[PDB]
Amino acid sequence: MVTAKKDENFSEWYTQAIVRSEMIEYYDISGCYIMRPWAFHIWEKVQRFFDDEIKKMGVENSYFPMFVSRHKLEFSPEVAWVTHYGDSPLPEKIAIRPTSETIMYPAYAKWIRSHRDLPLKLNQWCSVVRWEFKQPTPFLRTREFLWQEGHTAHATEEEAWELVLDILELYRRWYEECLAVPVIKGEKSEGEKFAGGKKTTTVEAFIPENGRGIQAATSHLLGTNFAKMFEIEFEDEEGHKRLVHQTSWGCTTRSLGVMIMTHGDDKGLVIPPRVASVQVVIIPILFKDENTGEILGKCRELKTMLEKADIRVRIDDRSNYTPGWKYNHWEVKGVPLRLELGPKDLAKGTARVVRRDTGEAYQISWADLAPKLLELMEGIQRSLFEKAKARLHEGIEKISTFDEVMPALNRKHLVLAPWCEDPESEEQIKKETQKLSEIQATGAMKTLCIPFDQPPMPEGTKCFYTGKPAKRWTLWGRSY
Amino acid sequence: MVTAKKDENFSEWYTQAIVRSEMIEYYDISGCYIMRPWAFHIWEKVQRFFDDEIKKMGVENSYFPMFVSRHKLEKFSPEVAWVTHYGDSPLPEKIAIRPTSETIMYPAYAKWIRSHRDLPLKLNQWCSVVRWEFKQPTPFLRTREFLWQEGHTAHATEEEAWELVLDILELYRRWYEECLAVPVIKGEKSEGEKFAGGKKTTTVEAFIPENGRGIQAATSHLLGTNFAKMFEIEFEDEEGHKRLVHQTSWGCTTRSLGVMIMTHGDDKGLVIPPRVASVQVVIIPILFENTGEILGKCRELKTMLEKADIRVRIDDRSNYTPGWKYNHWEVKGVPLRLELGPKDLAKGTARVVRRDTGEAYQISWADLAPKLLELMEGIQRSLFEKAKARLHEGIEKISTFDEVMPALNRKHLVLAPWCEDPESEEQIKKETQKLSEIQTGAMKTLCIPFDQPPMPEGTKCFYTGKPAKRWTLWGRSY
Ligand SMILES: Nc1ncnc2c1ncn2[C@@H]1O[C@H](COP(=O)(O)OP(=O)(O)NP(=O)(O)O)[C@@H](O)[C@H]1O
Ligand SMILES: Nc1ncnc2c1ncn2[C@@H]1O[C@H](COP(=O)(O)OP(=O)(O)NP(=O)(O)O)[C@@H](O)[C@H]1O
Ligand SMILES: O=C(C[C@H]1NCCC[C@@H]1O)Cn1cnc2cc(Br)c(Cl)cc2c1=O
Ligand SMILES: O=C(C[C@H]1NCCC[C@@H]1O)Cn1cnc2cc(Br)c(Cl)cc2c1=O
Ligand SMILES: [Mg+2]
Ligand SMILES: [Mg+2]
Ligand SMILES: [Mg+2]
Structure with missing residues (x-):
């Protein structure tokens, strides 16, 4: 853990x-x-x-x-x-x-x-x-x-x-x-x-x-x-x-x-899920010998069912580990879905499925698994991306003057800034942000890219740093 | 060439x-x-x-x-x-x-x-x-x-x-x-x-x-x-x-x-x-003057052959004669050449030549995919069966050390009963090397084959004259 x-x-x-x-x-x-x-x-x-x-x-x-x-x-x-x-x-x-x-x-x-x-x-x-x-x-x-x-x-x-x-x-x-x-x-x-x-x-x-x-x-x-x-x-x-x-x-x-x-x-x-070798792990819940033969056969049947829909399924039927050790193991490893099958679930013809990103649980009948898992895997995949995109967007700050830079860097953000694109200025800028970063105590600021997707540039807009007329919005920040 | x-x-x-x-x-x-x-x-x-x-x-x-x-x-x-x-x-x-x-x-x-x-x-x-x-x-x-x-x-x-x-x-x-x-x-x-x-x-x-x-x-x-x-x-x-x-x-x-x-x-x-060829079938149009008739048909044929999972290329290069092209793809080892010229366009056919034997076939367009799938499997099979026969002819079964040098001089491997004593292998290596010079040239063990020929009772090691254990395969090596 x-x-x-x-x-x-x-x-x-x-x-x-x-x-x-x-x-x-x-x-x-x-x-x-x-x-x-x-x-x-x-x-x-x-x-x-x-x-x-x-x-x-x-x-x-x-x-x-x-x-x-x-x-x-x-x-x-x-x-x-x-x-x-x-x-x-x-x-x-x-x-x-x-x-x-x-x-x-x-x-x-x-x-x-x-x-x-x-x-x-x-x-x-x-x-x-x-x-x-x-x-x-x-x-x-x-x-x-x-x-x-x-x-x-x-x-x-x-x-x-x-x-x-x-x-x-x-x-x-x-x-x-x-x-x-x-x-x-x-x-x-x-x-x-x-x-x-x-x-x-x-x-x-x-x-x-x-x-x-x-x-x-x-x-x-x-x-x-x-x-x-x-x-x-x-x-x-x-x-x-x-x-x-x-x-x-x-x-x-x-x-x-x-x-x-x-x-x-x-x-x-x-x-x-699109890159997970195991999309769904099936865990038999086996304890005090309760129904152990019937739980395992159903696990195998569930697997053959799900791979007909091209789902990547592993049954963790390994003897020498407890069901709880398996929950934890496949959580840490990041498997998108965990399907649990115990005695009770067996009696209802259902399974309990936990999605790894949000931790939400679902009760699902054997007959809806394939289409319900496919839907969940599409939702995990999209949801991971959208939350990461919103974090990306929350992390970039549109600015107009050099005075706005060090504060944006201290908030651990990137800046989108209008820039003349003169080679000498990037060097000046990085040497400068380094100076102010050393003094404040974590690194110089550089250009990451000039994005293809350019926001509008108003006629009199000036470069945030030199003061000369700007050409394009350039994204800057600290970097690996 | x-x-x-x-x-x-x-x-x-x-x-x-x-x-x-x-x-x-x-x-x-x-x-x-x-x-x-x-x-x-x-x-x-x-x-x-x-x-x-x-x-x-x-x-x-x-x-x-x-x-x-x-x-x-x-x-x-x-x-x-x-x-x-x-x-x-x-x-x-x-x-x-x-x-x-x-x-x-x-x-x-x-x-x-x-x-x-x-x-x-x-x-x-x-x-x-x-x-x-x-x-x-x-x-x-x-x-x-x-x-x-x-x-x-x-x-x-x-x-x-x-x-x-x-x-x-x-x-x-x-x-x-x-x-x-x-x-x-x-x-x-x-x-x-x-x-x-x-x-x-x-x-x-x-x-x-x-x-x-x-x-x-x-x-x-x-x-x-x-x-x-x-x-x-x-x-x-x-x-x-x-x-x-x-x-x-x-x-x-x-x-x-x-x-x-x-x-x-x-x-x-x-x-x-064919199982590993990058191109399985090269389509060579008979062109010297382009008008779209031949090339258009060659594209349609490539699309049809690809539907059947055939790896196809069209050699549409302008400055080479068809003969130059046949040779070029032959040197590369493409297993099947499909030739398409005006006469072929006129008759609904294509002429296919096999790289391994040179045999030519006339085939209707409609029959191309299945006939080419069949040929490929014939070629793959025939390449193996021929190599297997050459392998067999390259091995001489022998009983005595005196049959060794002549078998090696025939560019052949030997299959011989061997006691499997480790000192004997070092000796056989030295003595075969020394005879290769006075005539690397050393003959060494290649393997002891899982597929053992019959070993009659009392059969002796070809080298020591002690009782033989198994047949061992020997020759010159990489
Ligand atoms: N040491 C590294 N380890 C892992 N990935 C690397 C490494 N160096 C570069 N990369 C990645 O490989 C891509 C192409 O390499 P390259 O364009 O040569 O990088 P670079 O010029 O060395 N970048 P940088 O090391 O930051 O100066 C880079 O854009 C990085 O995404
Ligand atoms: N230099 C090489 N180049 C290409 N393939 C090689 C090379 N050396 C070995 N091999 C192949 O790789 C296989 C496994 O390598 P290995 O078992 O280390 O061979 P080895 O002991 O180095 N054989 P050898 O060097 O001829 O005495 C060998 O059986 C050969 O088929
Ligand atoms: O490696 C590159 C440029 C590009 N080469 C082809 C793959 C994509 C890559 O961006 C930049 N680069 C990066 N690091 C290098 C380190 C050394 Br050492 C050398 Cl010699 C050369 C280089 C060097 O050329
Ligand atoms: O490489 C081998 C043993 C096996 N390693 C895994 C792949 C299959 C192979 O047969 C034998 N061998 C061959 N050549 C070697 C060369 C050097 Br240098 C070293 Cl250190 C070690 C070796 C060495 O161990
Ligand atoms: Mg760099
Ligand atoms: Mg580098
Ligand atoms: Mg060796």
């Missing part, structure tokens, strides 16, 4: 919740964690979702090596270097993958010759390693992390930009539709974008309990900057040699940590 | 075929290779197949770190890759890249397992492994980075652990024989060949005729209790007494793709079994 309160010590709550639901096991190399089966199931669900979707776009999977040679790689303090095999030193040291541009792009130069070879659309599911300097957090910031990375190459900027946006929408679907986590689509500012690219888009999420925005995934319009460094050129139809226009995009096991932080409570995890 | 001949210059043939088919790209770090979509899709198929099967046995997936600290790993040496720095800074202890995950998984098992009610514990992971192999790299078969799965289970008893060893072994036979159409032989490794951290090692063995080598295809270990003793993986039984767990581990790699390539390939290139 979980005992730290989510709203008191958030850190300790998260650690307890992920350990006691058997999602992660700690490890001796710092910043690395073991992903146990209960967490791995959720990743498997989002993986299959995303993978299926990108295949409909013609993206194909591949696997490129985990090693890149020193001279091809040449961010530096993060790179893990292999220097030896056994007691022997490598003639030239080798780096483990931190990203795969330097591994993929020279091959792309070789394979692309003509318009007939475009678009080239590849992905890979793999792990990367970055010797993170920041405080590690299981899922959210780890030194080895699982991800996919998508890398595409096209004839025109328009087609590449369209795929950038399609992928971004798929990531809104991974968070929103699978994980029931609300995200904001935006553009990264010039200071925050991937420097090898032209434009970076993001989906951004929010952790209410510590006030932090967090980048949930990313999708880059790379332009022709990398085609030029790597000599990725093709002949069009009229015999002419052109640079490719490229995209890349990635999303990681960070997504699980965001889910856990978003929906969990004081009793531990709450898993949204 | 492939030009090295598969029987005559096998090594060149293999390199050409995997490169020209667009399966692999060569890379500047030795023994590492890019797996392009054409190959990777086959990996995805076998992965999905094996993963669904082990999920039915209650095995669950997990991801353990790729890094293991020196003190945990050294609880082989020359193969370990060591990370000593991050950026310009030295780590306090050097970290190994996971050559295999025993030393990463078993301390966690020792934490998680306390009572009989925690058992069985059954995990698998899909990951890559790194070993700095001393032997010559070969794409797929022996690489310095490879993809695999590793399964590791723990049981209250030896008998349940063994049951699982054999079930996993059966799944490996299905990975090879049902998905890749590659015949394999189940058997027990000898004492010198088994995994030394285990009690008994079971295997599926395969055979490459063109160089006469056996190759271990996959492996499944009854580990017994020795790791449980080493890592202190113990549980209280039902009476409160502490007991050691009984463990298994098993694994299979991208080696399997290379075996499939070599098994079914011919002088024109790859031949991919």
